[PDB]
Amino acid sequence: MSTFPWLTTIILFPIVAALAIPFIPDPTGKGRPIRWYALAVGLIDFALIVYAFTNFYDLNTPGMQLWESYDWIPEIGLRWSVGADGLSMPLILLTGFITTLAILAAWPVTLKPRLFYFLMLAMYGGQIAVFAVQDMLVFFLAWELELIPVYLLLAIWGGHKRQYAATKFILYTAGSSLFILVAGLAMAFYGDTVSFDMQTLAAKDYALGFQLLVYAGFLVAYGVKLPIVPLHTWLPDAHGEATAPVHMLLAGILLKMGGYALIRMNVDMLPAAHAKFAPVLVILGVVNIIYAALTSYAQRNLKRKIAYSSISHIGFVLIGIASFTNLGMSGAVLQMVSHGLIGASLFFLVGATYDRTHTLILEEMGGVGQKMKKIFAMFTACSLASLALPGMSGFVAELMVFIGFATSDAYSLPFRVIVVFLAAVGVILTPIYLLSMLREIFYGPENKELVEHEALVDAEPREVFIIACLLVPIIGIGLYPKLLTQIYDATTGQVIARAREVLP
Amino acid sequence: VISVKPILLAMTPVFILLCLFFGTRNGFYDTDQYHGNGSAH
Amino acid sequence: EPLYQYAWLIPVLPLLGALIVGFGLIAFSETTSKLRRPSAIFIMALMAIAMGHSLTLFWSQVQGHLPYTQMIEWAAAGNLHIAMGYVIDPLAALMLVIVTTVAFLVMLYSDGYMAHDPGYVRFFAYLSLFGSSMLGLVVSPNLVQVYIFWELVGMCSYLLIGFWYDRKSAAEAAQKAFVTNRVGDFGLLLGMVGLFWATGTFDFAGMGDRLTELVNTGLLSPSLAAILAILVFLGPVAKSAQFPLHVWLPDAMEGPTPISALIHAATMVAAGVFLIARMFPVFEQLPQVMTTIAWTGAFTAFMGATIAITQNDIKKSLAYSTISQLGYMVMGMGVGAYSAGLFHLMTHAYFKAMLFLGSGSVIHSMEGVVGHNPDLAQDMRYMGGLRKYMPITGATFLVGCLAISGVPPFAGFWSKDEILGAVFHANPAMWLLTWLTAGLTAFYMFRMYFMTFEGKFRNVPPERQEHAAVPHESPWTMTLPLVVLAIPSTLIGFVGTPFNNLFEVFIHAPGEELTEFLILGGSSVGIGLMGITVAYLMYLKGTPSPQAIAKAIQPLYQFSLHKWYFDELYEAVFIKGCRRLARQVLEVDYNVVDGVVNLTGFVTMVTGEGLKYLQNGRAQFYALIVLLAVLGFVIFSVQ
Amino acid sequence: ATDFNRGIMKFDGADSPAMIAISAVLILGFIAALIWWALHTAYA
Ligand SMILES: CCCCCCCCCCCCCCCC(=O)OC[C@H](CO[C@@H]1O[C@H](CS(=O)(=O)O)[C@@H](O)[C@H](O)[C@H]1O)OC(=O)CCCCCCCCCCCCCCC
């Protein structure tokens, strides 16, 4: 061990192992020792994640665990302070799981495999660095750590409008991490201490007016990363023009930071401004759901339709954040894990059927399900998981968000009536698009103009293995939610009890 | 309430060994049926 | 007793049949698809264990044994505590034995139905998944579990209608069925969430009386409780195909016929009536909710009985018949006749399952003659004289027509008679309507029987396009469930007679529990024989031929033939409107918001493609700028 | 814009600037109305 630096090893071991990528011998050029080395590093890091979790993480402790705090730069208060909370540990486990599955799903790449698996391991160490660190300047560092890796994963591999997508992504995310640094420096220079630690910054007492400004800066910075529909248009370009492993860890994990940090430094740090801004967050989550379901329906592209569905499923996260109950916050964390699994399965399957059919337009690709039957089966199962089907993890989080919002007596009664009415029309709208695209992509008679040009080969055993590894925790959490809720029910119980002290 | 830790500790070496096994079980992208390089363009 | 402690194994054991076989069908797909008969034996064996656990629980409920409940905590919070589990009520065990027997006979039927089909094993995996989800639906104690297994049953309904995914009509019908059931699940979820908000129990008997504690106090105005109850009722509107949301069930006949027996006429579609029976503690206090439930059921019965007359398809007319009978059940549950509505539910799912199994054997013997085309093999105007070719199908269809017509002492006279007797004592304006549609029901059902099983063959003249030229008999696997279902279609109507009503003692409403019966039982049987003799004169004996009558009321014939123009209406307002709204919101997203983003990126590019001209190559201009800067900084540094 | 006018979503005059402007003011005005209403109707 419990004195071993665990989260420092978890963060830095994929980066240090990615520095050994150009020294791996590979005479054939296609990059098979590089993909096996990256899969080995991903599996070893996930094994160390689950070993630290099952030994040195206590499920009944609301405070920070696995705590390390090394002294980086004492002049400015820069410390390497890492820690595993209840808001962090499901996302750390999900990051390890989805990044290992994305490295395994990244196996058809042969364009620049050394650079590809270097960037994927440098995202593996750097995604966990967002959920793990407890210093605000290191939070800004780990937040901006995905600027150049996602740029090069977007711009070299995947898509025809990939350069504009990568450009808009990197400029938009840099202009939002601007506000990350501004709000962190503002709330760390408040009062007569320059402690940059996130617990000490949550322990301060900021006046209102300062809290509203820091919440506005954090809200811009997280409403870009979490897709909030005025600030969401980086996502359909940056996700409709990405390869399937990059899209897997791009909307399975990178949308969850910014949504993890909506709890960490907007609810747990500025509750007096959260109590002022929470009706706006509830309405913006409702508009996320309905708006992105409608734009999912109108998309004739496949990847942009699934990208807009990924925008739609975080509105329940927003409603669960801005509802002041334990079940609402628990359903918000449950949605940011369940949508990670469900979405990553959908992006992998969309990339698989694009690697087979060589087209993204729903007006092509007619009776494709006659030839790839396993891709049809897995795609129907994961699309059903997206529809909030019970027995799968997408329904439980949405039901908990609905119940935890409607029972929240902090809001008025017509507000709760209008919101849970409007949040429930996405229950209609998600089967509409996600079954019209199934009807248009896999069903019907076989498109003979397509099968003459492309080899419609069925799924590999590796792809069936990846979708089964994604669907096992989906069904296992939708059948028994206290597998996951028991990881974070203490800390969220610490958060809501800290955030209900402001409401009248 | 059952604990997630023995379930996760019993399912992760199976996950690691089956990842290492199902890496060696691909039959479309390593053949000439796949006209691509892994990038989606 | 270990059978009451392990009753949760009644839904779990078919799910394992969906879990094993499905995992055999996605991993070893080259092996399991050749394992047709062992997979069928495995699935039927697991459901035969379930039918025999449910039989023993049902007979233990008949002989006493006050209702059992084992709950578990499912989703926990501070003070909310969503709970799951199972309950063995009289109604729960009755629905258990209904679902298990009908699913077992439907799988034994599908053994012979899907024999000449490549999708044999996937069909049985789907049937075990549906058996699991429905057997978990009928034992459900909470309202949150009659959303969980409710929506799982809707899922496997979508999976089974789109079974032949190579067809386009089956695809659109499966998507329409899932979305149209989801229009009711929106509203079931709304009323469920609002009833946990108002009451806070997720329990039928809990929000039965805590709603009374609320609404008798100043809290929770009765208009809000009526809104919550009508929202809850919107689920059974979609699932049982009531008046607005009925348009999915006739399209749902584009799947196979064993599922249109089981999931679309017997078991799933009679689960909104099960939800009304379970929420009867909440519905019993609100008279406006009961009145709109009863009038929705009466108008659904009238609409289905009207549309079922002119349908030339053997399965579309049977789908409109089960829409009409579920309207009868919903109207019976709306006038406070709990036991009569559930008795008509038990009376149904036994002849309508048998009617659809006979329809499937008719379609299977026609597919060997006129071909595998569904528009030819299912048209009743090409069938004619099937009885001398199919004797046992004709017998087990003639019973079933007699059962739903309410003429003999068969099961179907006592149930509809009990419903109409409790409707006449409560509302005489709708008794006349539903008695006229009982006459219409006997008319269209014996029109079906006389167009299918009387006369001679009367094929399609110009084409066949590929055992033939004569209807053979369907095998023993497709005729033995017909004869087994013929026994409750005749005999178990006697358990709900007005003298010695064992059903009203077994299945009574929760909480507090002749000289007119022969008059109503003369009236319903008289309108049944009048409908039968009109069908016999029109479709078997000539002279009121159904082309002169169809030209005398030709506007009404085109109204009933085009199924009241509902789907076209739903293609005018709702489908085209949702596509137009989606296209407009996407145009707003791609143009306006991306215009702000690209305009931010553009007006920072033309200020530097136009700020570089400040540096123009002239050194003397640069020194002029330096000296102007010196002057300006002195001038601005001194005030 | 022309890539959205194909197949199911095919309406004449959908990507016209007048229709985009009226749908923009309708959608974003209901956004601003819902946000102002949430700040006014809901308390905390
Ligand atoms: C909410 C606040 C968050 C941010 C706050 C800080 C702002 C940061 C400003 C940084 C921008 C300056 C860099 C220069 C830009 C440039 O050169 O153009 C680059 C491209 C155009 O060139 C394109 O570039 C592509 C490639 S390229 O280099 O030519 O490779 C090429 O293919 C393509 O044809 C070409 O058109 O344009 C862009 O993509 C710029 C997008 C950056 C967006 C900045 C934030 C905008 C916030 C808007 C909020 C909207 C909400 C309102 C809704 C009602």
Ligand SMILES: CCCCCCCCCCCCCCCC(=O)OC[C@H](COP(=O)(O)OC[C@@H](O)CO)OC(=O)CCCCCCCCCCCCCCC
């Ligand atoms: C007690 C607790 C410990 C055990 C708990 C876990 C039990 C798992 C038992 C099932 C795994 C065995 C699979 C045999 C499978 C096997 O042996 O090979 C099966 C088969 C072998 O390859 P083939 O080349 O023969 O494929 C057939 C070809 O003809 C088709 O192209 O591969 C497949 O077809 C794809 C199968 C995908 C199946 C996915 C794997 C199962 C998912 C595992 C989920 C783990 C999630 C972990 C999350 C943390």
Ligand SMILES: CC1=C(/C=C/C(C)=C/C=C/C(C)=C/C=C/C=C(C)/C=C/C=C(C)/C=C/C2=C(C)CCCC2(C)C)C(C)(C)CCC1
């Ligand atoms: C007739 C009647 C019936 C009923 C039926 C039902 C079934 C109906 C329902 C219906 C429902 C189904 C309703 C719903 C509605 C919803 C609406 C109301 C919507 C709204 C929406 C909003 C308006 C949105 C907004 C959005 C857009 C606009 C864009 C994007 C953004 C936003 C978010 C803004 C019964 C049986 C009782 C009997 C008697 C009669």
Ligand SMILES: CC1=C(/C=C/C(C)=C/C=C/C(C)=C/C=C\C=C(C)\C=C\C=C(C)\C=C\C2=C(C)CCCC2(C)C)C(C)(C)CCC1
């Ligand atoms: C890692 C991670 C962790 C953990 C998890 C675990 C805990 C899981 C559980 C699990 C459980 C303990 C299990 C139970 C159950 C299972 C199920 C039961 C399965 C099923 C499967 C099926 C059988 C499938 C099938 C197939 C597929 C493969 C595809 C498609 C088609 C089909 C559907 C046919 C957490 C927490 C953070 C979350 C996230 C992730």
Ligand SMILES: CCCCCCCCCCCCO[C@@H]1O[C@H](CO)[C@@H](O[C@H]2O[C@H](CO)[C@@H](O)[C@H](O)[C@H]2O)[C@H](O)[C@H]1O
């Ligand atoms: C030790 C303290 C100092 C740390 C310094 C950091 C740099 C570490 C040493 C890098 C230099 C040695 O670099 C070594 O030679 C060359 C560089 O020409 C590269 O060698 C490479 O050659 C070609 C590509 O050019 C590849 O096909 C081959 O697989 C790879 O080995 C590798 O990088 C490494 O094999």
